[PDB]
Amino acid sequence: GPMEEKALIGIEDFLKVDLRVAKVLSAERVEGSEKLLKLTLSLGDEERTVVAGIAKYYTPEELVGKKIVIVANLKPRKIFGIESQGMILAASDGENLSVIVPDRDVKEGAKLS
Amino acid sequence: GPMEEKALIGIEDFLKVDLRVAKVLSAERVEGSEKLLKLTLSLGDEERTVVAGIAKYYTPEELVGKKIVIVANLKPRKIFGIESQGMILAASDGENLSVIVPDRDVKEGAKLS
């Protein structure tokens, strides 16, 4: 369940996920939508387009040029006529929303798993 | 395998892992080990003890008081006599290691999944 408490998992279930560091090359508004943002991200040797519902929480000024953590091995989908592959990590406390960045300026493409 | 290319996954496999923001309360060294630090982490309403092999890259001083992303629902294990339950997110690029923090200040225990 999306709102349920998550039972204990082994390291395998974590290793199934491909967490990576990606540099936001650009973040533009999605036409016909006030909540979506189309973000191009560099993973070092490959680029990725991700549609994220964070337009009300993040302006593109506070995103472009930053290194953020993403899930790279999500199956591709069609969001508002845009081919989006993967998704961004985002933490909420019920009040604010925040993207997820590395503590030190690690290079783009750095893996977490 | 850890060095293998990870196949594409559905979002359920991601939702199965419990990624949370936790505040580092303390960070001490582990007796008999030169690589491991024992960190206590506040999740707002509950605490966690995690042993991490990052002493080569992080001193206690550059960790305590920070908000870092962790996997909170990992099965517990006895590491060097310490009961550790949970794992800290860490990004590496073959040259530098970095813990993972929220871009914006979010309340401890903030849910990412």
Residue numbers in the entry:
A (entry chain B), B (entry chain A): -1 to 111
From the primary publication:
Across all domains of life, a widespread class of OB folds have specialized to recognize and manipulate tRNAs, perform key functions in tRNA trafficking and metabolism, and are designated as the tRNA binding domain (TRBD) superfamily (IPR002547; PF01588). Trbp has been suggested to facilitate the folding of the tRNA structure by binding its characteristic elbow region formed by the intercalation of the D-loop into the T-loop and was observed to enhance aminoacylation by several aminoacyl-tRNA synthetases (aaRSs). Contrary to previous proposals, Trbp111 does not recognize the global tRNA structure nor its elbow or anticodon but solely binds its universal 3′ terminal single-stranded CA dinucleotide with a strong positional, structural, and sequence preference.
As described, Trbp111 forms a homodimer where each protomer adopts a canonical OB-fold architecture resembling the Greek key motif, in which five β-strands assemble into two three-stranded β-sheets which are joined to form a β-barrel. The core OB-fold comprises residues 16–89, with the flanking N-terminal (1–15) and C-terminal (90–111) residues of each protomer interacting in an antiparallel manner, forming a central interfacial region. The interface involves an extensive network of hydrogen bonds, salt bridges, hydrophobic interactions, aromatic stacking, and cation-π interactions, altogether burying ~ 1955 Å2 of solvent-accessible surfaces. These contacts produce an unusually robust dimer interface (theoretical ΔG ~ − 22.5 kcal/mol, Kd ~ 3.1 × 10−17 M) that resists denaturation by heat, SDS, Urea, or guanidine treatments. Full denaturation was only achieved when combining heat denaturation and 6 M guanidine treatment. This compact, ultra-stable protein-protein interface is consistent with the hyperthermophilic nature of A. aeolicus, which grows at 85–95 °C. Its resistance to heat and chemical insults is in line with proposed functions as chaperones that may aid the folding of other proteins (e.g., CsaA) or tRNAs (e.g., Trbp). Our Trbp111 apo structure superposes very well with the complex (RMSD ~ 0.6 Å), with key side chains occupying nearly identical positions. Therefore, Trbp111 is pre-organized to capture the terminal CA dinucleotide of tRNAs.
